Amino acid sequence: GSHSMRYFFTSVSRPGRGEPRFIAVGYVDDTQFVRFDSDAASQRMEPRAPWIEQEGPEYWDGETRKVKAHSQTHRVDLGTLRGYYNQSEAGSHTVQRMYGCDVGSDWRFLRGYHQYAYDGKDYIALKEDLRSWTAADMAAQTTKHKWEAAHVAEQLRAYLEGTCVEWLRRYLENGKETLQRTDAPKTHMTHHAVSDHEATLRCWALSFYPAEITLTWQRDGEDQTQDTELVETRPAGDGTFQKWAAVVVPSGQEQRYTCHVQHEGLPKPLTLRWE
């Protein structure tokens, strides 16, 4: 199917506690292979996946070199964005940045992106055409005009359509055993008495990859969207994911209910039922 590479940059000012914290993470689809914590010992870009570990000195040197530059860019920004909003130099604030690229089945460029947030809100971001910007407010327009002037978008388009997809394609090869896999959910249902007329029938999906999954409950075919408790898809810690969905069933009606699982890695969707 299709694939994506994304980098996540978080910069947090710490007035009275030295320089801002800077963390960076890299993903291909739902797997990470890069990472960097300004606070760590190495002061290096480090590997977080087995298939990236033997890239070489050049790669590691290149990435480390650039990530340090990213960190410095964000140090400046935190100061600039204080003034923009006439903020007191006491408060700790956050800058977030995400960008990456997608390819399709044919592994050709599909779409690129690049957004930016101050204190948890859309600040400024590149549009789908990769030629223009969309500012969230008054402050951000100034930034818009700056980057428009400096032809910044044109360079992001070049990276996104080139280096970005190029290395995504290279990693998909490097880690083809990890990244080109389809771990089908292993599924089952649990039943637990709440009272003397109510039971707990929560469905389970375990050890699947990628994260994208759909768990739904039904009564007599009817969807119980509003009556289902659904958890966020969660990391197993081993590179797989988990999710469950529970409904309450007036004891005696269990057979009215079915759970439905849809995932890339299943031939067909599953129709469980506490028959």
Binding site: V34, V67, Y99, Y123
Partner: peptide, 5 residues
Amino acid sequence: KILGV
């Protein structure tokens, strides 16, 4: 590889 207000 990463990009080289």
